[PDB]
């Protein structure tokens, strides 16, 4: 019934509030009754280091019946048949309506650390377990290092890692925070770091405010976007001149080989964001629009595509600037087009020239003096947009 | 002086390093234990990607900070 | 096509009205275009006794194209490749828009009894069929007794059995029937059973009415629930005193280790059922609420959890009462928490003490006299709730 | 005197028993044919679970009644 | 030469007997002192259920200790 | 979430407008996030002639993450592990939000023609590729000719062929086009075909108009349907007389053995189409109803079933007319009941007698004179419905 | 020395001929008696289709019996 | 004079034939290259099924027309 | 004995040096002529990045050609 799907959400919330690091699951796209779970081999067991996927199907009537759960990954265990099904009987005889999936897979993770040789699904693996242990361990280790440990698979786990990270990174940091005086920076740093406090004293010198961006790997593009968009909240001639280049950029890119229908999406987010500049919105309204996950990210995607576009356009300007042995396009596909990939000097110059605008970047790292080096790109153009580079991260500054 | 690197397996590993150390040095000290080549290592401190040739005092990682080790297993 | 999904329902209704015992199918959860069918090996064939699953995928446009059907279970047949696909050509060349899935799988069940060696998917199995029969039969028998006959799989079938049973048990019996004079019982029994008719004469002695519950394995909990809930339709002090213990019971159980979010569901069904007592509803309104499948079952679940709770609480009171070598908690997980598992003396005493209430149970089996033994639990407390125990089943009686 | 037990395979089997017989006896008579051990047998008459040590006259199974045989195949 | 019995109703009932008696006459003694008939009675001495035919010292049932009593209430 | 499924449709439209003959994909029934793609081995590669299926799963958030794609068919490639995953890194490291699935699988088709031995998923296949080529080729050829080339599989591909065809056939032709003067036919044919132009001069003789049907294999039934239905827009006695026979035909067929629930669907489409005749609709409204894909096709299905019905009914009339060694029913299941199967003389006579109506068929092929032979069926009955037979195709003519 | 032909329009047409004639001139005779041309004609003698070049006694076609006639209407 | 037949593998094959040729002849010329028996061949021009005994001038396939070859691989 | 440097700001700056100098003092010379400090500087001679400790003729760096200069801007 509807109570079923109603319940699966409750269980997903329970699994949500507490991540079970090694043992975790989730639905497949659209489908609520189809789940899939990644399970890492627990350490101090022959299965360690390998990754074991398993698929879950919920009954049409939950939770009056147990979910069907089976390993899609081959594994050597007395309680898991090589056909993939598990011998744990809370899924069969002993099932209760009061049990979460959490209980199930945390009982499976427990089935891996400690096997169950007395109630075997496969009698031979049980027999080997109860008699010759070294055999069992070694076998389980190659069954790990072929089937579980192999290649691809790992990616999903390593992707999960990323997801686990920049979600909690997103719990501390918002996309674009408020406009705060930069005196807060003093508090971020240590008392044994005097050198930094000197850089920051010397920062209070030039700029009265700061606005911070989430370190998602897009730091630069996010900062660039908000700063330049609020910068056009004043200059009307520049707002129009900007708007025109934006509109040109779309077909400029399509005629540069990018598929149109896919980049149109991002284009319209750019143009609507410009549209709440054009019709003047108070800066906080824009910020609210920027702290929208999809609106923001769609923008960032477009900015990346625009740097890519100008790079392809200029390829000879660049190609011998490229660190390593790649091309310009190879470097685009690797280091620029994809999301959450770091931005460098080339990126900033490329985007700046692409939209034909000036930016100032304040560099502060370990430099001996109280010197925080300004960088105006391209040179001499008096910048109305100011950013701060701390190592590995970009934010924005206000005069 | 002492920091915490949290890996893919959920397991944490603790390490002894001066704030003046390289990142390269840290990846090397990690390779001293797990044997994961500094090649296939990449480190992330608080949303910040970590550069092989920088210091810890650079990225403001202090004593008792937690950074993550993501393996880039050479792909395909 | 929306006509497609519209049609699949019609076919599911056709398959619904007539169960095809050996050959039957159904959708997987959410998905209408993904079906799965269990097929028992027909007797007088080497495949008998084994269970063969197969998966079905419907075309986006039904029924202008045949459904893709394939065995997920390995089998030895000239017309089924070891890769799982079937050679029956009503699924390929000869398909018609006028054919139900019923036709298909009933043609497959026919493909098993009588193979088709002239149009082989695998020429070798065909060759063996046409030449050496004993080989064919034996082979098919081990291919049955490893792949099909093995373990696990069976459960689904044996679960289906249950489903086939207590659904038709639910066709005769409702959850909680009306309030009828117990003179009906005379009609249930035989003329060669005088002894029972004497028990029943002696029942007309004490009680003027009866109300019957569906024999779903929950008989006791269902009866207890309705009887005690209508019993509080009178006594207000007891209704309040009861309500309070109910509210306490939730966190009492959570603090006893039960996960909260999962048991909250059932709690609220309990409390709403109390709420239509609290605000007085005519008994038939409550009955209507009780003949609601989910409301009723959710209640029954909670009652089971409550017996479990009191049992865990009292574990020393009990543990040496437990038939067999189990614990108190082992006995809970096995014999009490799960649905449709039989209730015994321990169960009734446990629940009764748990909610601190009195119940009277009228036992009638073969006892020589006209004696139907009353049981007041716990002793001496004058019961306002009366039940009848026939062997294997519980109902409720009215003075 | 004569009853019908309907199994998992959809097939029905008919049996000769007095109403005074045990359930244990019935499971034994079934084991006489199919060889399914009374151990792995369990019987259900009209939603009622059937107890090894009771009679038929107990559960009100009369001549020409249909009860089901569910196998509990020893699990896991 | 006598033992005790405990019923989960909250009550402890005690009866007089000899070590050589069967289970049946015992149940009958409880049927006299309380009045629940032997066809309803199921008793367990510390984890194991007792059979009618077998005697007291057969199940060895030292005469100090306590066996626990439960009615045959199986149903559903 | 919403934007994801919103986007997958855009990509499906992109893949729709241009069929990529060898490399093509699509969703599985209901599910948008589950796709499946057939890929033919490119010629001049060891994989040629074999068919390789692969399954696709989209992330819950598209397109911020790459789709998981894997071969469900075993194949020998340095970049595809025998476990089925692919080594192409636009699916892992280099993924961009600006990329269609088209890019992906067209890059895979490119991965097959030209392998990638430097970044191996399986080092041994890479090693064999870089050293001994003949081994590699031969191996890949048997891995083709067992796993890919085997049996069933082919059908899906050959079905895809059909789909690729009559969809683009449907891009040029509509189901039922407008009513145009037959002077257009002159333009269809060549200047070296005088003989045809003479047939067509001689066609302008009899008929002033033409209406063309899509060559989907249903040409005859589609034409028959529209022509006869607009023909009853005038004669009321015939419209009623027709309606009655239609209503009789349903149970006539059910009593002839056809399952009712399945043919009821098609029946109601027939009867509703009659219903917009009964209440008079301007011819173009009917045409609009006929250019509806499902309404039209449902009709065509019924007409096929009706010919089948009359054929079964008359079996002795026919059976010795049947070309080859089939029965009447065998011929029905093979040549009549299924969709998109060609119609012949027997078909037309059968349907005509079935509904008890007259039709005129104008035959023009190579006949020496300017003679276009009229055929009135059954003979002498003055036809109010006129069709044109060009070889292999049916259309309708207007006096 | 003549045979008959049956058309499914409901009609049975009969013509005069010799056992040694080809199929072509036969079709032509039907083209005279009815007037549907040979390029449209397909005839079957009891299950097998006849070829233009082959003769009557070639296909052996006893002169009593009946061959059935169908136009070449293939289309779609 | 010259036409284009597009096969299952996406590959196109070009052929030299007069508009007066058979379809049978065309299938034979295709069998001359790929070896696909005319048996297992079937041809489709612009939604039209193609008849073994007809001409090209029949079906209005002109010079530079594209028709498809669907294999009917003898089934089951 | 001197070479050139190109910065993507659009500018080409040129400095005087010897073939035997390390990378450090070179970066320092650029720090004099322009004023961006060596701790910010990353230079690449045609595809490969240069290390501080290594010399000019060590990386072989013929004195005609041009190495390209990029700041260390990595961030995110």
Short mmCIF file of C-alpha atoms in Angstrom, two decimals, chain F residues 135-378:
data_model
loop_
_atom_site.label_atom_id
_atom_site.label_comp_id
_atom_site.label_asym_id
_atom_site.label_seq_id
_atom_site.Cartn_x
_atom_site.Cartn_y
_atom_site.Cartn_z
CA UNK F 135 45.96 -13.84 -31.40
CA UNK F 136 44.01 -10.75 -30.31
CA UNK F 137 41.86 -10.71 -33.44
CA UNK F 138 41.07 -14.43 -33.38
CA UNK F 139 40.25 -14.39 -29.67
CA UNK F 140 37.97 -11.37 -30.10
CA UNK F 141 36.34 -13.23 -32.98
CA UNK F 142 35.35 -16.29 -30.97
CA UNK F 143 34.39 -14.11 -28.01
CA UNK F 144 32.19 -12.51 -30.62
CA UNK F 145 30.94 -15.77 -32.13
CA UNK F 146 29.94 -17.35 -28.85
CA UNK F 147 28.82 -14.58 -26.54
CA UNK F 148 27.76 -11.78 -28.91
CA UNK F 149 26.85 -13.66 -32.09
CA UNK F 150 24.75 -16.29 -30.39
CA UNK F 151 21.13 -16.75 -31.33
CA UNK F 152 18.31 -14.85 -29.66
CA UNK F 153 20.40 -11.71 -29.12
CA UNK F 154 20.34 -11.04 -32.86
CA UNK F 155 16.57 -10.55 -32.83
CA UNK F 156 16.77 -7.41 -30.71
CA UNK F 157 19.22 -5.90 -33.18
CA UNK F 158 17.13 -6.99 -36.16
CA UNK F 159 14.12 -5.57 -34.36
CA UNK F 160 16.00 -2.32 -33.85
CA UNK F 161 16.59 -2.30 -37.61
CA UNK F 162 12.84 -2.36 -38.17
CA UNK F 163 12.34 0.38 -35.61
CA UNK F 164 15.05 2.50 -37.17
CA UNK F 165 13.33 2.06 -40.51
CA UNK F 166 9.62 2.65 -40.09
CA UNK F 167 10.23 5.51 -37.71
CA UNK F 168 12.06 7.42 -40.43
CA UNK F 169 9.51 6.05 -42.88
CA UNK F 170 7.12 7.77 -40.48
CA UNK F 171 9.19 10.95 -40.66
CA UNK F 172 8.49 11.30 -44.40
CA UNK F 173 5.01 9.79 -44.45
CA UNK F 174 2.17 10.42 -42.02
CA UNK F 175 -0.34 7.70 -41.14
CA UNK F 176 -3.10 9.10 -43.33
CA UNK F 177 -2.21 12.19 -45.36
CA UNK F 178 -4.57 14.86 -46.66
CA UNK F 179 -6.83 14.58 -49.68
CA UNK F 180 -4.75 15.63 -52.65
CA UNK F 181 -5.35 15.54 -56.38
CA UNK F 182 -3.63 12.55 -57.95
CA UNK F 183 -1.67 14.85 -60.26
CA UNK F 184 1.01 14.65 -57.58
CA UNK F 185 1.81 11.10 -58.69
CA UNK F 186 3.35 12.42 -61.90
CA UNK F 187 6.00 14.05 -59.75
CA UNK F 188 6.81 10.89 -57.79
CA UNK F 189 7.92 9.01 -60.88
CA UNK F 190 10.68 9.34 -63.46
CA UNK F 191 10.92 10.61 -67.03
CA UNK F 192 12.32 7.28 -68.19
CA UNK F 193 9.23 5.67 -66.78
CA UNK F 194 6.73 6.58 -69.46
CA UNK F 195 4.74 3.41 -68.98
CA UNK F 196 3.88 4.45 -65.43
CA UNK F 197 2.99 7.98 -66.52
CA UNK F 198 0.57 6.32 -68.95
CA UNK F 199 -0.96 4.29 -66.17
CA UNK F 200 -1.31 7.55 -64.25
CA UNK F 201 -2.83 9.47 -67.17
CA UNK F 202 -5.28 6.60 -67.28
CA UNK F 203 -5.77 7.04 -63.54
CA UNK F 204 -6.68 10.71 -63.89
CA UNK F 205 -9.25 9.19 -66.22
CA UNK F 206 -11.30 7.57 -63.44
CA UNK F 207 -10.41 9.27 -60.15
CA UNK F 208 -10.02 12.95 -59.26
CA UNK F 209 -8.25 12.53 -55.90
CA UNK F 210 -5.89 10.41 -53.83
CA UNK F 211 -5.11 9.96 -50.14
CA UNK F 212 -1.85 8.25 -49.17
CA UNK F 213 -1.03 5.89 -46.28
CA UNK F 214 2.26 5.18 -44.51
CA UNK F 215 4.05 2.06 -45.82
CA UNK F 216 4.27 0.41 -42.40
CA UNK F 217 3.16 -3.02 -43.60
CA UNK F 218 -0.38 -2.19 -42.53
CA UNK F 219 -1.00 -0.16 -45.70
CA UNK F 220 -4.10 -2.10 -46.71
CA UNK F 221 -5.84 -2.15 -43.33
CA UNK F 222 -5.16 1.53 -42.69
CA UNK F 223 -6.51 2.52 -46.11
CA UNK F 224 -9.56 0.22 -45.82
CA UNK F 225 -10.36 1.71 -42.43
CA UNK F 226 -10.29 5.38 -43.36
CA UNK F 227 -12.01 4.94 -46.72
CA UNK F 228 -14.92 2.83 -45.43
CA UNK F 229 -15.38 4.95 -42.31
CA UNK F 230 -15.71 8.18 -44.28
CA UNK F 231 -17.94 6.27 -46.70
CA UNK F 232 -20.50 5.76 -43.93
CA UNK F 233 -20.53 9.51 -43.29
CA UNK F 234 -23.30 9.55 -45.90
CA UNK F 235 -25.36 6.36 -45.96
CA UNK F 236 -27.20 6.12 -42.66
CA UNK F 237 -28.84 2.74 -43.25
CA UNK F 238 -25.42 1.32 -44.04
CA UNK F 239 -23.87 3.05 -41.03
CA UNK F 240 -26.41 1.38 -38.72
CA UNK F 241 -26.22 -1.96 -40.53
CA UNK F 242 -22.43 -1.74 -40.17
CA UNK F 243 -22.50 -0.77 -36.50
CA UNK F 244 -24.60 -3.84 -35.68
CA UNK F 245 -22.22 -6.25 -37.40
CA UNK F 246 -19.36 -4.59 -35.52
CA UNK F 247 -21.03 -5.16 -32.15
CA UNK F 248 -21.78 -8.76 -33.12
CA UNK F 249 -18.18 -9.33 -34.21
CA UNK F 250 -16.76 -9.01 -30.69
CA UNK F 251 -18.51 -11.96 -29.06
CA UNK F 252 -18.45 -13.65 -32.46
CA UNK F 253 -14.67 -13.71 -32.05
CA UNK F 254 -14.74 -14.54 -28.34
CA UNK F 255 -17.03 -17.47 -29.10
CA UNK F 256 -14.53 -18.31 -31.81
CA UNK F 257 -11.90 -18.68 -29.08
CA UNK F 258 -10.23 -15.27 -28.78
CA UNK F 259 -9.66 -14.05 -25.22
CA UNK F 260 -12.18 -11.30 -24.50
CA UNK F 261 -10.39 -8.83 -22.22
CA UNK F 262 -7.52 -8.39 -24.65
CA UNK F 263 -9.64 -7.82 -27.74
CA UNK F 264 -12.08 -5.54 -25.90
CA UNK F 265 -9.45 -2.80 -25.99
CA UNK F 266 -9.26 -2.80 -29.77
CA UNK F 267 -13.03 -3.26 -30.03
CA UNK F 268 -13.71 0.00 -28.20
CA UNK F 269 -11.34 1.92 -30.48
CA UNK F 270 -13.23 0.53 -33.46
CA UNK F 271 -16.57 1.45 -31.88
CA UNK F 272 -15.50 4.97 -30.86
CA UNK F 273 -14.20 5.56 -34.37
CA UNK F 274 -17.62 4.45 -35.58
CA UNK F 275 -19.11 6.76 -32.96
CA UNK F 276 -17.60 9.87 -34.57
CA UNK F 277 -19.11 8.69 -37.84
CA UNK F 278 -22.52 8.00 -36.29
CA UNK F 279 -22.56 11.51 -34.89
CA UNK F 280 -21.35 13.14 -38.07
CA UNK F 281 -17.88 14.62 -37.89
CA UNK F 282 -16.33 16.57 -40.74
CA UNK F 283 -13.91 14.27 -42.55
CA UNK F 284 -10.84 16.14 -41.24
CA UNK F 285 -11.84 15.48 -37.62
CA UNK F 286 -11.88 11.78 -38.40
CA UNK F 287 -8.50 12.12 -40.13
CA UNK F 288 -7.11 13.82 -37.05
CA UNK F 289 -8.37 10.85 -35.06
CA UNK F 290 -6.74 8.52 -37.60
CA UNK F 291 -3.36 10.24 -37.47
CA UNK F 292 -3.36 9.49 -33.77
CA UNK F 293 -0.80 6.70 -33.48
CA UNK F 294 -2.56 4.53 -30.90
CA UNK F 295 -6.14 5.04 -32.10
CA UNK F 296 -5.10 4.12 -35.64
CA UNK F 297 -2.93 1.18 -34.66
CA UNK F 298 -5.57 -0.20 -32.29
CA UNK F 299 -7.99 -0.12 -35.21
CA UNK F 300 -5.53 -1.88 -37.53
CA UNK F 301 -5.06 -4.59 -34.91
CA UNK F 302 -8.79 -5.22 -34.77
CA UNK F 303 -9.12 -5.38 -38.55
CA UNK F 304 -6.37 -8.01 -38.62
CA UNK F 305 -8.19 -9.98 -35.90
CA UNK F 306 -11.40 -9.76 -37.94
CA UNK F 307 -9.80 -11.18 -41.09
CA UNK F 308 -8.35 -13.88 -38.86
CA UNK F 309 -11.81 -14.55 -37.44
CA UNK F 310 -13.54 -14.91 -40.80
CA UNK F 311 -10.66 -17.10 -42.03
CA UNK F 312 -10.96 -19.49 -39.08
CA UNK F 313 -14.73 -19.48 -39.64
CA UNK F 314 -14.48 -20.48 -43.29
CA UNK F 315 -11.45 -22.76 -42.99
CA UNK F 316 -12.51 -25.22 -45.72
CA UNK F 317 -13.29 -22.36 -48.17
CA UNK F 318 -9.65 -21.38 -47.79
CA UNK F 319 -7.26 -24.11 -46.70
CA UNK F 320 -6.42 -25.34 -50.26
CA UNK F 321 -5.96 -21.70 -51.35
CA UNK F 322 -3.13 -21.32 -48.85
CA UNK F 323 0.28 -20.87 -50.44
CA UNK F 324 2.58 -23.46 -48.93
CA UNK F 325 1.91 -26.25 -46.46
CA UNK F 326 0.34 -24.35 -43.56
CA UNK F 327 -3.15 -24.60 -42.07
CA UNK F 328 -5.70 -21.80 -41.95
CA UNK F 329 -4.88 -21.01 -38.32
CA UNK F 330 -1.13 -21.40 -38.87
CA UNK F 331 -1.51 -18.93 -41.72
CA UNK F 332 -3.48 -16.62 -39.45
CA UNK F 333 -0.88 -16.60 -36.68
CA UNK F 334 1.95 -16.22 -39.20
CA UNK F 335 0.58 -13.92 -41.90
CA UNK F 336 -2.48 -12.08 -40.48
CA UNK F 337 -2.85 -11.61 -36.68
CA UNK F 338 0.63 -10.06 -36.10
CA UNK F 339 1.26 -6.37 -36.77
CA UNK F 340 3.20 -4.99 -39.75
CA UNK F 341 2.94 -8.25 -41.68
CA UNK F 342 2.01 -7.91 -45.34
CA UNK F 343 -1.54 -8.26 -46.66
CA UNK F 344 -2.47 -10.25 -49.77
CA UNK F 345 -5.54 -11.08 -51.89
CA UNK F 346 -6.84 -13.61 -49.36
CA UNK F 347 -6.68 -10.92 -46.67
CA UNK F 348 -8.83 -8.47 -48.61
CA UNK F 349 -11.47 -10.98 -49.65
CA UNK F 350 -11.59 -12.29 -46.07
CA UNK F 351 -12.12 -8.88 -44.47
CA UNK F 352 -14.56 -7.82 -47.19
CA UNK F 353 -16.76 -10.87 -46.68
CA UNK F 354 -16.30 -10.56 -42.92
CA UNK F 355 -17.91 -7.13 -42.75
CA UNK F 356 -20.09 -7.90 -45.77
CA UNK F 357 -19.01 -4.91 -47.85
CA UNK F 358 -17.81 -4.09 -51.36
CA UNK F 359 -14.42 -2.69 -52.33
CA UNK F 360 -12.76 -1.70 -55.59
CA UNK F 361 -9.01 -2.15 -56.00
CA UNK F 362 -7.17 -0.42 -58.85
CA UNK F 363 -4.15 -2.42 -59.98
CA UNK F 364 -1.37 -0.71 -61.89
CA UNK F 365 2.01 -2.26 -62.45
CA UNK F 366 3.73 -2.90 -65.79
CA UNK F 367 0.69 -3.84 -67.91
CA UNK F 368 1.42 -3.06 -71.55
CA UNK F 369 -1.56 -0.84 -72.32
CA UNK F 370 -2.64 2.20 -70.38
CA UNK F 371 -4.77 -0.35 -68.61
CA UNK F 372 -5.28 -0.06 -64.86
CA UNK F 373 -7.38 -3.06 -63.87
CA UNK F 374 -10.33 -2.52 -61.52
CA UNK F 375 -11.22 -5.31 -59.07
CA UNK F 376 -14.63 -5.37 -57.41
CA UNK F 377 -14.87 -7.67 -54.41
CA UNK F 378 -16.90 -9.60 -54.10
#
